Structure formats: C-alpha cells, structure tokens
Amino acid sequence: FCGPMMARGKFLLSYSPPNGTQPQTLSEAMQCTYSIWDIGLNSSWTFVIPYISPSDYRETRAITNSVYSADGWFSLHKLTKITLPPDCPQSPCILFFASAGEDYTLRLPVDCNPSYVF
C-alpha cells in the first residue's frame, strides 16, 4: 500500500478456483479462499495463491482454455472504504508484486517467443 501513513482501511484478497463465471459480488468472493488484509505499521501482504489442480503439473500457456492452464481468478475487493484524514491525497495506490512460492517447480523447456526483437 503506497498511500499515506495516516490512511487506514481493509482489503479482501480472494483467490477463486475455476468456476463457470467469475465472482463479482463481495459475498461471492467471501465464500472462496480469501484473506482480509489490514493497513497499519506494516505495509505488505504476501498472499500465497494455493496450487489447486486436478493434475500434478499445470500448463503455462492457455492456447485452448481448460482446467489444465487456467486456475481461476484473483480478485481484490475493498472491504471497508479507505478513511483518509483531512489534507491527505485522495485515491491512493496499491502496488502489486508477483513472486513464486518456496515449492515452485518448472518443467519441459520449449521454444521462446522472439516477438520482443521486432
């Protein structure tokens, strides 16, 4: 959370497994796997997205979309609105990262995409 120090509020960090339709309501993401994140003295929250898969490995290139490549949606809801004190900038900025877990494993090197060099 890259906002001011005096800002408070709570954020809901809900990973949904693959369903027929992406959840939109806060009550539809509460039923999934979530974690309510608080703002305070610390300013980070490593939401470890679990590995829920019908196979031992998952595909990493959704050419034809299936349950072997797409593993459901991530969704960040604002649970309570951000209570800013007077004379503080409106609309703060949540900054996202993406690391890998301590058990993240890879397999089968394929050919790359030279689309960067064009």
């Binding site: 408070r8 309510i36 003295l41 309570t80 609105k81």
Partner: protein, 267 residues
C-alpha cells in the same frame, strides 16, 4: 502484542488494534460436552463450519441518538440472512437438524479514525426478543433497512412492546405495562461486552459458550445469544472527515453439536 491473527478453517481474519478475546463465563468456551438429551450420534464440527462468517451491519451517522441500538440474533441471522450474513455450509446444515448447540465467537469491526469521537457498546445479550416486532413476527430485510437503528424508547426500556398472545374478546384487554424481556440500557455492561471506542480499538473480540434452558435447544427457533451494538456516545466529526463509518461483524460458531437429522425446514 496488539496484532492478533485468528486462523479458523480457511477464513483467517486479522486485526492490528485488538484488546483481547473476552472469553465469557469460562476459561475456554471452545471446550463443550455432547448433549445428554439425545440418543443418536451428534453431527460434530467439521472443517467447513469451523470458520468466520463475515456479515454487514447498518451504518452509523450523526443522526443516531444515545442508545439507538441494532440487534443481531444468533443463529437467527443465519436463517433470515440479516446484513447479507450467509452461512453457506452452516446454514445448509442448520436447516437439516432439529437440535443445534454451539457456542459463538463474534468480532465486530468498526474503523473510526483518530479524529472521530463516539463509542459503540458491543455486547452479547442472552435471551432477548429484540428483533421480533410486537405483533409476533420477526423483522424482514426491508424493515431492517427502513429504520437502520432501533431507538431506545420507553417501550424498550420497560419491556412493554414484547410479543404476546392476544387474550380475545372474552377478556378485557389490560393496560400492558411491563415484560421481562426489557432492556435496561444503563446495565448492558453486565453482559459480555467490549466498548468499541474511537481512540483505543477498531475491533472488539467476544467469545461466549452455549447457554440455554435445555442441554440442546431447537435449531429454527432459538435465540440464545444476541449481538447487541449500542451507541453510548454519539458520533461527532468536523466537516471533511470520513462520513458514516460502516460496521461489520464476524461470527464463528465454536464447537457445534447438531442432532436430529431431517430434511430441509419447510413451514
């Protein structure tokens, strides 16, 4: 220190200004014995109903006077879905059992800033009919929306508007003056309570065991505990501050012992 994360099942919640889990009437209210008024094997807890059920509560303005309260019946909020509080795997099990018996562990969040003043009185009140209209029927979702806050009139202080059986045309109807499900608003702090002050905390932490006249009460009718958010000091803020802070509440049923499996409850 003041940062307590309470992992339960899969829904783990957090707070960074906690005051402490007010365990009520016992040391560990999670420990509970099976009922002695049943001979079948009770459906104990499992990892889909041992979790936190977060709902919403109505907002809190400057127009809220002193002692305007708002009651959440337990487990009456799971049936009527008060504040969007959907139980999921708990409501779909509580409709399929005749005797339910669980302790509750509630937690009301309300994030006041350091420039607001006002103090809620979040308390768990045993055995009241504060949701039920005086005609006999409980409030719907619109009736919990048209008013947003139940004002402490003379009828709630005395116990005059509690539901009753009409005597009929044979008797002469008396002047109803008292009834034992009153609120004494000056004495709500006898209950397991924590004050949600604007300058000490944003979340109160209450933990209550099972109490009741029978070793396990019914499922579709009981009103054992009742979450009771009462406004002691009214809200005040200078203009420009964050207006109308919302109130949530998170309910976790500790150690439920269902009995008497039957099909889904149809009146």
């Amino acid at each position: 220190d003041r940062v307590t994360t309470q992992t339960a099942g899969n829904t783990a919640i957090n707070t960074q200004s906690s005051l402490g889990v007010l365990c009520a009437y016992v040391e560990d209210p999670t420990k509970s014995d099976p009922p002695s008024s049943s001979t079948d094997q009770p459906t104990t807890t499992f990892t889909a109903i041992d979790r936190w059920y977060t709902g919403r509560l109505n907002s809190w303005t400057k127009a809220v006077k002193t002692f305007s309260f708002q009651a959440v019946p337990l487990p009456g909020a799971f049936l009527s879905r008060q504040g969007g509080l959907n139980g999921g795997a708990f409501t779909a099990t509580l409709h399929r059992h005749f005797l339910m018996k669980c302790g509750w562990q509630v937690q009301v969040q309300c994030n006041l800033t350091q420039f607001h003043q006002g103090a809620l009185l979040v308390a768990m009140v045993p055995e009241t009919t504060l949701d039920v209209k005086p005609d006999g029927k409980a409030k719907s979702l619109q009736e919990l929306n048209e008013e947003q806050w139940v004002e402490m009139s003379d009828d709630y202080r005395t116990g005059k508007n509690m539901p009753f059986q009409s005597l009929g045309t044979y008797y002469r109807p008396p002047n109803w003056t008292w009834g034992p499900n009153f609120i004494n608003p000056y004495q709500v702090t006898v209950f397991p309570h924590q004050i949600l002050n604007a300058r000490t905390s944003t979340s109160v932490d209450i933990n209550v065991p099972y109490i009741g006249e029978t070793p396990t009460q019914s499922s579709e009718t009981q009103n054992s505990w009742t979450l009771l958010v009462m406004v002691l000091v009214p809200l005040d803020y200078k203009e420009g501050a964050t207006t109308d802070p919302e109130i949530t509440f998170s309910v976790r049923p500790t150690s439920p012992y269902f009995n008497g499996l039957r099909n889904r409850y149809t009146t």
